[PDB]
Amino acid sequence: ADEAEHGLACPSYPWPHKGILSSYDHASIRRGHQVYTEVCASCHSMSLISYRDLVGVAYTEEEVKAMAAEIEVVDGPNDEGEMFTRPGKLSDRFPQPYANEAAARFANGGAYPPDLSLITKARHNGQNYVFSLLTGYRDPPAGVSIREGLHYNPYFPGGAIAMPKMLNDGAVEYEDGTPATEAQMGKDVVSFLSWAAEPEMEERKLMGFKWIFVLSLALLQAAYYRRLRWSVLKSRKLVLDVVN
Amino acid sequence: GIFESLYKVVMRRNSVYVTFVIAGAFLGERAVDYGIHKLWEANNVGKRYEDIPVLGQKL
Amino acid sequence: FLDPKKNWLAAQHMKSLVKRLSKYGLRYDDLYDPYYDLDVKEALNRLPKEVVDARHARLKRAIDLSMKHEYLPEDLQAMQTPFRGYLQDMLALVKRERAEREALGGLPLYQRSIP
Amino acid sequence: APPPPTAMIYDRA
Amino acid sequence: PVDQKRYLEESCKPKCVKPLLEYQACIKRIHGDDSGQKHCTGQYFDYWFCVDKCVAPKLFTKLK
Amino acid sequence: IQPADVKAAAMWGVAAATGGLYLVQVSILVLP
Amino acid sequence: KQIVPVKSVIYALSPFQQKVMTGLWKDLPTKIHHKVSENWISATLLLGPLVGTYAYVQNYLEKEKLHHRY
Amino acid sequence: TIRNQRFSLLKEPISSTLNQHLIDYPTPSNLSYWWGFGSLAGICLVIQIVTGVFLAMHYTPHVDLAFNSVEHVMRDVEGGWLLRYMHANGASMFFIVVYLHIFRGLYYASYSSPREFVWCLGVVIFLLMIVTAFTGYVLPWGQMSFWGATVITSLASAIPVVGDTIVTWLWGGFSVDNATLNRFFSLHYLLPFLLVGASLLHLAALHQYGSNNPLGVHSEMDQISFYPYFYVKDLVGWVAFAIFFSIWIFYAPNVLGHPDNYIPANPMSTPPHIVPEWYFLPIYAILRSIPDKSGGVAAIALVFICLLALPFFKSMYVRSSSFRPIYQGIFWLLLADCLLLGWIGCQPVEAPFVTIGQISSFVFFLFFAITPILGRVGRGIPNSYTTD
Ligand SMILES: CCCCCCCCCCCCCCCCCC(=O)OC[C@H](COP(=O)(O)OCCN)OC(=O)CCCCCCCCCCCCCCCCC
Ligand code: HEC
Ligand code: HEM
Ligand code: HEM
C-alpha cells in the first residue's frame, strides 16, 4: 500500500564527508571509482564527468592518461568525411554503455538504468538512500510474492526494483588489498557517487567557514558602530512642559 | 595607551588610513586562510589525495 | 451595546488599554493621526493652542520613550489620564457639519489628494 | 493620583 | 569476505525482538489465512527500521 | 600650499597603487 | 510635510563619553522577564494552532496506518 | 539664503535629489529593524539581478542544452557553483525578506491611510516577484521545472470563454517545449527591470507620505535624518543577512529545493510529488484546497482582491497593534494560519489535509473579512471608556 509505495525509510549513516570541517576520503573515492568501473559501468552511465575530473582527486595524471587510452571513442569527420575511432584522451567524458535510452530500456527489460552523475542529489536523503538501496536486497515479507523479472528491495518505492543484486562479496579485487565485502563496496561506491555529484564540496566548506567567521567579526563591528552613532540620541534628557 | 599610540601613527591623514585598511585586509585574510587550512588538515588526516597508498602503482 | 460596567470582557479590554496607554504616557485621542482622516486635521486646527501643544508634547515624549526602549517611571505612570479625551466633541461637530453639507448640495471644504 | 481637570492649563482649555 | 552488515544485523537481532515478535505474529496469522492479500509489510518495515537504526554507527566504525 | 598639495596627491597615489595591487596581486610584475 | 516644534530643552552627551556595549548586559533577567510576561499570550496564539494541528495529524496518521495494517 | 557661491557638494544640483531622498530624508526616531527588512529586500533584488546576468552569460535556452549548460556552470566555470547557488538561494532569501516586510506591514497596519498607494504598489511588486521566480524556475529544465510549468500554465484553462486559447497561445505549440523555454528565458530576463521600476515607484510614494512607526501615531515631532542614523541600523541588518545567506550558500545549499529538479525533464513519466517552490506553497495550498479548478483560480484572484482591499477600510482609527489587543491576537492567528497553509501545500491530497486546507484558507479570508468590524467597534470605544 502507501508504506510500500514510499519505501522503507533510510537511516542516517555517519559518512566520512559529513561535518562543517570534513573532506572526502580520497582513497575511498579511488576505490569507489574502481568498483563503478568494474561492475556498475556495464549498465549505468555518468556522461557529466570527464576523465580530467579524476586528476588530483583519486588518480595521478599519467594514470588517467593510460586509463583514457584504454578505451576508444568516435571522432569527427576526417578529410574524407568518414568517421573513425581513436583512443580516448584526457578530456573525453566517461563512456556510455548504451546507444540511447531506447537501447538501454531494451537491454534492461523496459526499465532505464538512470544516469548516475547526480544520483545522490536526485533522491531524497541521497547518500543514505543509495547505500541502503545497494545493501538492502532482502527476502520479501510473507505473502507479497512479487512478479518474475524483478527483485524485492524494501527501500525502493514499491518494493520491486529492476536491477539484480550486484554488490557481492569478493566481486572485485581492490588494488590496495582492502578486503572486498558488500558493505565496504557500497560505502566506496557511494563516496565516489557523492563526489561525482558534488566535486566542489571541500572548497565550498572552506569558503563557508572562513566567510562565516569573518562576517561574524564584521557583525560585531557593525553593532558597535550602530550603538556608538545612536548613543548621543539614546542617552539624552529632554524637558517637555507636560505631565499627563 | 597602545590605542593612542597607533592613533597618533596612522589616524592623522586619511590616505595613510586607507592604505592601512587595505594592508590589514590583505594580511588578515591571509592569516585566517592559513589558520583555517591548518585546522582542516588537522581534522582530516589520512583522507587527503596526496597520501593514498596506490597513488602511483597503476603504471 | 453592553460594553461598560456590564461586560467582563469589555472591562478587561479597558484595563489593558489603560495599562498600555499610561505606560507610554499617551492618551487615546493622541492616537488619531491628522493625516489619516482629514477631519482630525480640521478638529485639531479648531482646538485651542494649549490643548494642541500638550498633545504634541505627549506625542514627542512617547516617541522618545519608544526609541529609548523604556517606559515612563512609575510616578508619571500613576499620574496619567489615558481617557481624559479632548477631541471627540470637536470631531463629532466637524463630522456633523460635513454630514449636512453633503446632505444638501455642497462642495467638500477639503478633499484628500490623490497620491 | 492623576490631577483633577482644573489643575493644568490645557485641561482647563 | 564475511559481510560486516549481515554479521552486525544478526548480532543486533536480539536487541529489539519485540517488532520481530509482532512480525512473527503476523506470519502466523497469514499462514492461518492462506487466501487473502495477506501482506502486512508494516511489521516488516518496523522490524527492519529498528535493525537499520541499530546498525547505523557500528557499520562504518567497522568498515575500512 | 603647493608642497602640501603635492604631498597629499602623492599619498593618495600610493594608496591607489596599494588598492590596485590588493585587487590584482601580481607577483609576475612585482618580481622584475 | 512640515515639522511641528514642541518647545523642549534637550541635553545630550557626546558618543565618546559613554559606554557603548554595556546596556545590552545591564539588566538581562529583567528584560527576559519583561519579554516573557508581555508576549506569552502572543506566543500561545502563534505556536498553539501549529502544535495542536501537528499532534492531531500524527495521531490520525497513526490510527489510519494501524487500521489498514492487515 | 541666496546661493551665490556653492557651499556643499551635497546641495549642488548634481547631488541635490540624492541628498534629499537619501541623506536628509526625515525619519521617525523610533523605527525598529523591519524597516531594515525593506532595505534588505532591495539589496536582495540587486544581488539577484547581478548574479542572474553573470549566469545568463553561460545558460543556453534550448531544450537540448539547458540542463547540461547549468551543469557546465556548476562544474567547469571558474567559481560558477557560487553563482548558481547564490542565484537560487537568493531567490529564496528575497522571498523570505519580502514576507517579513509584508507581515510587518500587516502587524503595524501600515496599509492604512495615507499609504494606500504604497500598499497597492507593493501588491503589484509581489505579483511581479511571483511571475519572475516562476518563469526562472522553469529555466533549469528538470523534472520539477517542466512539470510545474505544465501544471501552473494549464490551470489557466479555467477562464470561461477564452481559457483554452490563452493556454495554447502561452504554451506556443500544444506543450511546454523549446518554444516555451525560449519564451520563458526572455521573460525572466526582462521582468526584473520592471521590478526595479516598481520598487522605485514604491519608494517614491512612501517618501511622499513619510514613514510609519511602531506606535502608529503622528511622528513629525521627533524626526531625525536618514543618514547616518538609519544607514548604520540597515548595515547591521545587512551583515546579519549576509551571515544567514552565507550559511545557506556554503553548507546547506540544496535544503530549500527538491531533488527531482536534478533529473532531466522526461515528459513521459511523471514524478509522484509535484509541488512548486516553498514560497509558492501557501498559494498552491489555497488553490488545491478549493476544488473545481475554476473556483481555485477565482480564489487566487480573490486573495489578491482582499490584499488590494485592505487599505480602503472605513474607520480604522488606531493604527498600531501595540494598542489593539484584539487585532494583535487576530494577526498572530493569521500568521500561524499562513504557516500551516504553507505546510499543507507540500502534502498529498489524501485526507485529512483536504479538511485542514479547506479550513485554513477559510480562516485566511476570515481574517480579511473581520478587520472592518474591529475598526467600527474601536471607533465606538472612546465614548464608553471615559474615566469621569
Ligand atoms: C469551534 C468554532 C469556533 C471557533 C472560535 C470560537 C472562539 C471565538 C473567540 C472567543 C474569545 C474572544 C475573546 C475576546 C475578548 C478579549 C478580551 C481582551 O482584550 O482582554 C485583554 C487582553 C490584554 O492582554 P494583556 O495586555 O497581555 O493583559 C494583561 C492585562 N493587564 O487581550 C488579550 O489577551 C488579547 C486576546 C486577543 C484574541 C484574538 C483572537 C480571539 C478573538 C477573535 C476571534 C476571531 C476568530 C476568527 C478569526 C481568527 C483569525 C483569522
Ligand atoms: C545492469 C544490470 C545494472 C547494473 C550492473 C547496475 N544497475 Fe543500477 N539499475 C539498473 C536498472 C535497470 C535500474 C532501473 C530500476 C528502476 O528504476 O526501476 C537501476 C536503478 C538504479 C538506481 C535507481 C534507484 C532509484 O531510482 O530508486 C540506482 C541508484 C542504481 N541503479 C545504482 C547502481 C549502482 C551504484 C550500481 C553499481 C553497483 C548499479 N546500479 C549497477 C541496472 C543496473
Ligand atoms: C521588491 C520588494 C520590495 C522592496 C524593495 C520594498 C522596498 C521598500 C522600501 C525601501 C520601503 C521603505 C523603507 C521601509 O519602510 O522598510 C518600503 C516600505 C513599505 N513597503 Fe515595501 N518593498 C517591497 C515589497 C513590498 C511588498 C510586497 C509590500 C506589501 C504589499 C510592501 C509594502 C510596504 C509598506 C506598507 C511600506 C511602508 C513602510 C512603513 O509603513 O514604515 N513592500 N518598501
Ligand atoms: C535580470 C536579472 C536576472 C537574470 C538575468 C536571471 C537569469 C537567470 C538564469 C539564466 C537562470 C538559470 C540559471 C540557473 O539555472 O541557475 C535563472 C534561474 C532562476 N532565477 Fe533568475 N535571473 C534574474 C533575476 C531573477 C530574480 C529577480 C528572481 C527572483 C527571485 C529570479 C529567480 C530565479 C529562480 C528561482 C531561478 C531558478 C533557480 C535554479 O536554477 O534552481 N531571477 N535566472
Summary of the model, kept short:
Chain C is mainly α and 115 residues long. Chain C has helices at residues 8-24, 34-37, 39-46, 49-68, 74-78, 88-103. In chain C, helix 3 (39-46) crosses helix 6 (88-103).
Topology readout:
The structure is cut from a larger assembly and holds 8 protein chains of 8 kinds.
Chain B: H1 2-10, H2 14-43
Chain C: H1 8-24, H2 34-37, H3 39-46, H4 49-68, H5 74-78, H6 88-103
Helix pairs in contact in C: 3-6
Chain E: H1 4-12, H2 17-33, H3 41-54, H4 56-62
Helix pairs in contact in E: 2-3
The complex binds 1,2-Distearoyl-sn-glycerophosphoethanolamine, heme C and protoporphyrin IX containing FE (HEM) (2 copies).
1,2-Distearoyl-sn-glycerophosphoethanolamine sits between chains H (325-326, 329-330, 333-334, 363, 366-367, 370) and C (9, 12-13, 15-16, 19).
Number of domains of chain E: 1
Largest sheet of chain A: 2 strands, antiparallel
Shape assignment of chain A: extended
Quickly count the helices of chain A. Answer: 7
Which strands sit side by side, in order, in the main sheet of chain A? 1-2
* Rg of chain E, nearest Å: 15 Å
| Helix/strand class of chain E | mainly alpha
Number of domains of chain A: 2
Helix percentage of chain A: 25-40%
The largest chain-to-chain contact, stated as pair and per-chain residue counts, equals:
C-H, 39 and 37 residues
Measured as a percent range, the helix fraction of chain E is over 70%
Organism (chain G): Vigna radiata var. radiata
Protein name (chain G): Cytochrome b-c1 complex subunit 8
Main location (chain G): mitochondrion
Membrane topology (chain G): Single-pass membrane protein
